[PDB]
């Protein structure tokens, strides 16, 4: 209900909806050639328990977690104020935003066009996409 | 009982009788201050010496001194 709290809430939704989509378009992309084909022998070597505790990938994930830090340390102040960081994509978007508003009469609020639906669809779908494939060994009951 | 002695640092802001419990001090017209008041303690026989005027006393070194003297029924604050 308050300003500064819902700010981080809607931001975190946007800051992860793209992450919850490039990962889906990344996990599907890496397994597009091994989705079926005898169910990839129950995910084959892609099973996390089969991995050797990420021996070779741990030192790589540390580098990724480092660069991703400053990436979000650019996202934290670029959101602050309009100028510089957000202002240049500001008038860029305003170029399609003007045409989209012309198609949508007075203004056609883009956040109602698809800022919340995409943001929540990615989160909910990725939450269910991580449980059906990574959080169930014995099914017991058939899953449909 | 207790011996009340008033310094020459008085400003006359009446802090004594405001703080003071049983009204030992008293404001008197005086010709050598800014506000024109001076604290004076006639009823020193009834003084208890609780030393709550030195708290409200403004001056760098307090203006109302009460040196500890003898103790009687009037200065012990007892009801028996």
């Amino acid at each position: 209900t308050e300003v500064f709290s819902l700010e981080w809430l809607r931001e975190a939704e946007i800051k992860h909806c793209r992450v919850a989509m490039l990962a889906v378009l990344g996990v599907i992309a890496q397994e597009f050639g091994t989705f079926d084909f005898y169910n990839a022998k129950s995910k084959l070597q892609l099973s996390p328990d089969l991995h050797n505790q990420f021996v070779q990938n741990g030192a790589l994930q540390q580098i990724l977690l480092f660069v991703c830090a400053w990436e979000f340390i650019v996202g934290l102040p670029a959101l602050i104020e309009s100028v510089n960081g957000n202002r240049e994509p500001g008038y860029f978007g305003f170029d399609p935003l003007k045409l989209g508003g012309t198609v949508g009469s007075a203004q056609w609020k883009r956040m109602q066009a698809g800022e919340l639906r995409n943001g929540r669809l990615a989160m909910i779908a990725f939450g269910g996409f991580f449980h059906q494939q990574l959080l169930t060994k014995q099914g017991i009951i058939e899953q449909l | 009982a207790h011996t009340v002695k008033i310094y020459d640092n008085c400003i006359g802001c009446t802090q004594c009788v405001r703080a003071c419990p049983l009204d030992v001090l008293e404001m008197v017209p005086w010709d050598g201050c800014k506000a024109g008041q001076m604290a004076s303690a006639p009823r020193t026989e009834d003084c208890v010496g609780c030393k709550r005027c030195e708290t409200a006393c403004p001056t760098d070194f307090l203006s109302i001194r009460v040196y500890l003297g003898g103790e009687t029924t009037r200065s012990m604050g007892l009801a028996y």
């Binding site: 070779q56 030192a59 790589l60 | -």
Partner: protein, 116 residues
């Protein structure tokens, strides 16, 4: 603020000196009768017996040099712009480049990042 500016600039000059300090040596220890062949060979080969004495003497002499360079900066009563504005930028560009150049050799073979 101002304190970072002064440091951030002095270290930028130290950087610009460090690359040229290694450019003459590396180009001397790679081709033509080099006193140091591969980067893995002469990593810590001792020389003569004193060794540490000439090192500590070089340390003391360089320390006295910076001692005078600082004490002179105190005196003189110096002072109490676009070139300075470009220099404030390339100083930051220097400090972050000279850590990475050595980070290269710290990879043993400069290949562990890309998996194999």
């Amino acid at each position: 603020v101002n304190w970072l500016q002064e440091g951030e600039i002095k270290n930028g000059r130290v950087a610009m000196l460090a690359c040229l300090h290694f450019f003459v040596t590396e180009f001397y220890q790679f081709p033509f009768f080099a006193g140091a062949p591969k980067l893995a060979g002469p990593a810590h080969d001792y020389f003569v017996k004193s060794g540490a004495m000439i090192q500590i003497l070089a340390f003391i002499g360089f320390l006295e040099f910076l001692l005078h360079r600082g004490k002179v900066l105190y005196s003189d009563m110096e002072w109490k712009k676009a070139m300075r504005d470009r220099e404030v930028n390339n100083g930051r560009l220097a400090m972050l480049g000279f850590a990475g150049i050595i980070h290269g050799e710290f990879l043993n073979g400069k290949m562990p990042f890309e998996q194999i």
